[PDB]
Design a protein around this ligand. Structure first.
Ligand SMILES: *[C@H](N[C@H](COP(=O)(O)O)Cc1c[nH]cn1)c1c(COP(=O)(O)O)cnc(C)c1O
Ligand SMILES: Cc1ncc(COP(=O)(O)O)c(CN[C@H](COP(=O)(O)O)Cc2c[nH]cn2)c1O
Ligand code: NA
Ligand code: NA
Lengths: 359, 360
């Protein structure tokens, strides 16, 4: 085989399926499926987006390789100069790009599960070796053990999600600053920060040349399908990433949609506020379910430990049969939980109705 | 001193081109007053079904199908090849890079046959592979006897072969391709421009050659370069592993929707292809009459010219840009002596020739 040896036993990522595919499999129209498994924004993007997408002037022309219009808009949005900002085909592209540019095969990376499964997946694809330092029972980082493995094994980078996926807890500044004192590249993933009251740390990259901060349009801004994310990078790192990055992965539709979304700050704030409001209602409803233990969250989702002998995978599959999709991941660190995205109030109501009829 | 991998600290960047909105600002001209013939884009745009579909996307806020299965079903119908052999990429660019990422360890070797598409050498450098060059012959044909000899000597993992080639447009004949396929190497045949030729696609060959991959795109004939959607035919023993290593969601909803829509209008696709083939012949004869340009025959939607008579090819390209016409010049050893002119509308050719006369 021509395939690289380390890929021959790669464990694949476990993606989820969209409405058009779910319809065929569940026997339901898309409008008759409640989809709470990928932290998507059920309100969709501001109306400016579909107006812009239906009037793209140059679909036949390659996109701007420098995404300079969006980066100017992001400099306005973030307060960080555009020289520090890269745009990616989702935050996913930037996670992978960082690893491709920093990790030689055999280099080590620290991961803190339970967390976003793409870090371990991307490390495996790139031939890096993962050092797992598990989070504490309250999902907080074990900084003492992070420091120890960093001293002992000299990993090159660590990814840290805040608000974390899948539980939604936030990393306190002092923990992050303690890790930034180490000779390691820290990538702070702020994919869900808009659902919190915490300020983005994008500006910190000007004071820490071993910090990257990642963001996305996929969740709050309702553009998951168009694939557009971004990040703040130290100038000493971004100069090399520019040279190694693929020229045209950010499509014209991605750039146009993100710029259009930013033109409606009132819509973006209102949908965010609606989702934050429903998060509290959903939490209280799930807490009353005898076999679910929800955790507090600053994101647009709620993690539930499944208790009382209930099979968490079967719970997820049973709800899917009933027309409601929630997230279950089959690996050792996550298989005991289910993760419920925050949707419209009527989506929560359907979910709780289905839960009440289980078994 | 730096977190960046050592081999990337010396990387030569790719030289991309700029879109109309950036050109307008840089040149001080409206886009309608800029003639853009530097990236093999289709000036007619995609079939009208595409902008209709893009304006009515139902679920922009939902992740796309990680398996792009609706488009792959349509591509199976279009190509006659079963969908299990077909991958969809964020442009053919994604598939070129994906192949290299899955097949080349650092230090592994790839054969390249310049002058050709510069992304092969760029992607090889980014992935830490070693490029083994077998230059094409003076008529741009492959040197099969040298490819055979170098494969035995260097034991490379793969070879990329463009047909119609970028930047000259010549085609690889079946016997040369078959001889190369007998070698212990992965052969990637890049058919990005095949629709502008009279040659049939070889996607079906991957069912009998498990060391052949065939790449295609919607960016050129189908007018979807900005939406980023390409595809390829892969042996089942290779595709199984590419599926596992591929990023889940790089093919956007807009990419899948636009490509499916384009395929609903075969008449439009044929008519714009025929208009571009017709203008290719007219453009060739006009360029041939320019004393300091030597155009080469082409089966694609572009014409390569050797710049002769002591004329600076880079300055020619930059002077034309100052007049509002963009053609391709690439600054590397094998390509710097040429300019490449994409085939546009007849009126685009006419502006180009006016500007050439004003330099001459
Ligand atoms: C968005 N993650 C989403 C949920 O994935 P999962 O936790 O259920 O496995 C969807 C996704 C996207 N790629 C893989 N899964 C996300 C991203 C990336 O979002 P974009 O690429 O769309 O910008 C990055 N970082 C985090 C923490 C999350 O949750
Ligand atoms: C032989 C060949 N195979 C694949 C692609 C990629 O097509 P996609 O499906 O990804 O759109 C191209 C496109 N080449 C264009 C001219 O590039 P140029 O020759 O350097 O001027 C534009 C481009 C895209 N990426 C870098 N350049 C090509 O010619
Ligand atoms: Na409970
Ligand atoms: Na001539």
């Amino acid at each position: 085989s021509f395939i690289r040896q380390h890929l021959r036993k790669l464990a694949p990522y476990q993606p989820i399926l969209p409405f058009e595919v779910l319809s065929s499999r569940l026997g339901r129209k898309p409008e008759d499926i409640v989809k709470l498994d990928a932290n998507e924004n059920p309100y969709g993007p501001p109306p400016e987006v579909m107006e812009a997408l239906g009037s793209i002037r140059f679909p036949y022309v390659y996109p701007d390789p420098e995404s300079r219009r969006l980066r100017a808009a992001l400099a306005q949005d973030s307060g960080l100069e555009s020289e520090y900002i890269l745009v990616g085909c989702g935050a996913d592209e930037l996670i992978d790009l960082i690893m491709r540019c920093v990790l030689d095969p055999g280099d080590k990376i620290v991961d803190c599960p339970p967390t976003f499964t793409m870090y371990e997946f991307d490390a495996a694809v790139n031939g890096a070796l993962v050092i797992k330092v598990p989070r504490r029972p309250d999902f907080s980082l074990n900084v003492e053990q992070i420091i120890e493995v960093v001293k002992q094994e000299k990993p090159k980078c660590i990814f840290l999600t805040s608000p974390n996926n899948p539980d939604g807890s936030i990393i306190d500044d002092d923990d992050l600053l303690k890790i930034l004192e180490l000779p390691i590249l820290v990538v702070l993933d702020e994919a869900y920060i808009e659902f919190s009251t915490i300020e983005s740390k994008m500006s910190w990259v000007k004071k820490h040349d071993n910090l990257i901060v990642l963001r996305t349009f996929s969740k709050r801004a309702g553009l998951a399908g168009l694939r557009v994310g971004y990040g703040a990078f130290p100038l000493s790192i971004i100069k090399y990433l520019w040279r190694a990055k693929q020229p045209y992965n950010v499509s014209v539709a991605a750039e146009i949609s993100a710029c259009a979304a930013l033109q409606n700050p009132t819509y973006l704030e209102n949908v965010k506020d609606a989702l934050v409001k429903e998060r509290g209602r959903l939490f209280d409803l799930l807490k009353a379910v005898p076999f679910l233990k929800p955790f507090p969250s600053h994101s647009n989702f709620i993690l539930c430990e499944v208790t009382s002998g209930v099979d968490p995978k079967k719970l997820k599959e049973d709800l899917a049969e009933m027309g409601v999709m929630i997230r279950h991941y089959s690996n050792k660190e996550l298989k005991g939980y289910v993760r419920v995205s925050v949707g419209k109030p009527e989506h929560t109501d359907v979910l709780m109705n289905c839960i009440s009829r289980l078994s």
